[PDB]
C-alpha cells in the first residue's frame, strides 16, 4: 500500500488519490468512506442566539430590512472553525446604513470565520444591533426540540455538515508486475471548515474504531 496524495483544484474542493488496491477493495472502500463522510463527521454550527432589542422571532425590528427570522435562517450558512474548544460566545455590532457581512463580527483568537463576505441582513436606518450567539459542537444532526427559561433567548436548529457532497470513481492503474490494479479518486467538496485530507483521516479513524468490535 501507499499513502494518499491530494490535488488542490480549488481551495473549497479537493480530491485525494489512493493507489494501489487489490481486486474487490476499491468499490467497498469508496462506499464505506462516502458513508462515513456523509453519516457523522464532527463540526461546528450556530446555537441559541440572545438578541438585545428583539423580544421573539415574529416582531418588527426598527432599522433592519424586510425580515426578522430570515436573518436567523441566513445566519446558519456561516462556517465556524475552533481550536480546542466546544463553547464560545460571539457578538457583533454595527451602526448606520449599509449591509451586514459575516466578517463584521467580533471573533475570538481561536474562532475564525471562513467566507465572511456572505450577506446577513441590511440596515436602512441609524440604529444599533447586538446579537449574542453561541457555538456548540457534536455529531450527526439535532433539531431544536430534541436539544431543549429566559424569554429573550430564541432557539435555532443546529445542522452542521463540514462536507456537502462526496463522489468517487475507480479507474485502471498501470503496474508492470501484475495484470490490473484498482486506482480510485474521491471528490470531496467541503464548506470551508476542514481540509479534505484531515476529513479522510478522521473518517478512517472513525471506521477503524467502529471495526474494533470483532478483534
Amino acid at each position: 500500500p501507499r499513502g494518499p496524495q491530494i490535488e488542490r483544484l480549488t481551495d473549497n474542493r479537493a480530491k485525494v488519490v489512493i493507489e494501489p488496491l487489490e481486486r474487490g477493495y476499491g468499490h467497498t472502500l469508496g462506499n464505506a468512506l462516502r458513508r462515513v463522510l456523509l453519516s457523522s463527521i464532527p463540526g461546528f454550527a450556530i446555537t441559541e442566539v440572545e438578541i438585545d432589542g428583539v423580544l421573539h422571532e415574529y416582531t418588527t425590528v426598527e432599522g433592519l430590512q424586510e425580515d426578522v427570522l430570515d436573518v436567523l435562517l441566513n445566519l446558519k450558512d456561516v462556517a465556524i472553525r475552533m481550536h480546542s474548544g466546544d463553547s464560545a460566545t460571539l457578538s457583533l455590532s454595527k451602526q448606520g446604513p449599509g449591509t451586514v457581512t459575516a466578517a463584521d463580527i467580533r471573533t475570538d483568537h481561536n474562532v475564525e470565520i471562513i467566507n465572511g463576505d456572505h450577506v446577513i441582513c441590511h440596515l436602512t436606518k441609524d440604529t444599533a444591533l447586538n446579537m449574542r450567539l453561541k457555538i456548540e459542537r457534536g455529531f450527526g444532526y439535532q433539531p431544536a426540540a430534541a436539544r431543549r427559561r429566559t424569554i429573550g433567548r430564541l432557539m435555532l436548529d443546529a445542522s452542521f455538515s463540514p462536507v456537502r457532497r462526496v463522489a468517487y470513481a475507480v479507474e485502471a492503474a498501470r503496474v508492470e508486475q501484475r495484470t490490473d490494479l484498482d486506482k480510485l479518486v474521491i471528490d470531496i467538496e467541503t464548506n470551508g471548515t476542514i481540509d479534505a485530507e484531515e476529513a479522510v483521516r478522521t473518517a478512517a479513524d472513525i471506521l477503524s474504531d467502529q471495526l474494533s468490535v470483532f478483534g
Binding site: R34, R35, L38, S39, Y58, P143, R165, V166, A167, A169, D187, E189
Partner: protein, 50 residues
C-alpha cells in the same frame, strides 16, 4: 364581562404520514425519511432528494 384572545404560532415540521402532491396530478403520502448517505447519487455527486 372580559374576553381575552391569545395568538399562538407553531412551526409544523415534515414527518412520515404527510400527504404531498404534485402539479401534474400525482397525489400520495410520504413514506420514510432516509439519511442522505443512503440515497442514490449521480456521477457528479448530487444526491437525489425525492
Amino acid at each position: 364581562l372580559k374576553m381575552v384572545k391569545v395568538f399562538l404560532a407553531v412551526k409544523r415540521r415534515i414527518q412520515p404520514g404527510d400527504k404531498m402532491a404534485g402539479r401534474h396530478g400525482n397525489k400520495g403520502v410520504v413514506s420514510n425519511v432516509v439519511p442522505v448517505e443512503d440515497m442514490p447519487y449521480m456521477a457528479t455527486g448530487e444526491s437525489v432528494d425525492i
